[PDB]
Design a protein around this ligand. Structure first.
Ligand SMILES: [Mg+2]
Lengths: 168, 71
């Protein structure tokens, strides 16, 4: 994305590429610069990896701006919803549970994948069962909105589930 | 005299409530209010939901118990 231009160029002989994707031939650095000046445009050493390390006339700044504009759209959509995490607990009472459920629903609506996570302490006996009791129920409640991608899965001191929404 | 009618029956913990009061479902049958031993509290032995404690029971009212032994 970030390329090397006009006066950055030390590559003695460049396999010159004109304004539009031209093939003129192998011109000197200075020669290339002169050519660029003639058009007023920006000669861009795009690759030193090439054959006679190559410099290419374009409106560099403008081109970059264009890219950024395009890239902005892509970059905005590159994140486009990630993982929202919620940490339940083994005990969990009802209003709290409801609240959590609501939150999860909201997240789903927004578009995000949801890590339905449990932090633990001691007493691993009733743990997994208890987790199931919460988590599966929750999933069932949001079966209209969400799809199970990760099931009851251990992390050691924790447990974790994942809910991507139904429709993309 | 100390009336020794005290019913020494086991129960698996259903639920947690404050002050270390616990609805515990018994081997005997019911789930009734049963609060912690003082001993346990002193010894910091954390009762957690899903444990087979010994719920001592009064014949005047079984509906309330007292947790005696560590899970
Ligand atoms: Mg007795």
């Amino acid at each position: 994305k970030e390329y090397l231009t006009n006066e950055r160029i030390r590559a003695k002989q460049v396999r010159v590429v004109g304004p539009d994707g031209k093939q003129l031939g192998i011109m000197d650095t200075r020669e290339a610069l002169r050519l660029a000046q003639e058009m007023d445009l920006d000669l861009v050493l795009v690759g030193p990896n090439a054959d006679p390390p190559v410099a290419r006339i374009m409106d560099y700044s403008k081109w970059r701006y264009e890219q950024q504009m395009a890239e902005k759209e892509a970059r905005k959509k590159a994140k486009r919803t990630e993982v929202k995490s919620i940490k339940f607990r083994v005990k969990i009472d009802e209003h709290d549970y409801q609240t959590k459920l609501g939150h999860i629903k909201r997240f789903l609506q927004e578009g995000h994948k949801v890590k339905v996570t449990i932090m633990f302490r001691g007493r691993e006996v009733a743990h997994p069962e208890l987790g199931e009791r919460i988590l599966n129920r929750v999933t069932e409640d949001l079966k209209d909105l969400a799809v199970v991608e990760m099931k009851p899965e251990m992390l050691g001191r924790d447990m974790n589930m994942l809910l991507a929404p139904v429709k993309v | 005299a100390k009336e020794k009618d005290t019913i020494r029956t086991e129960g698996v913990v259903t639920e947690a409530l404050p002050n270390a009061t616990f609805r515990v479902k018994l081997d005997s049958g019911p789930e009734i209010l049963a609060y912690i031993s003082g001993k346990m509290r002193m010894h910091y032995i954390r009762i957690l939901p899903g444990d087979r404690v010994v719920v001592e029971i009064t014949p005047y009212d079984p509906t309330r118990g007292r947790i005696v032994y560590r899970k």
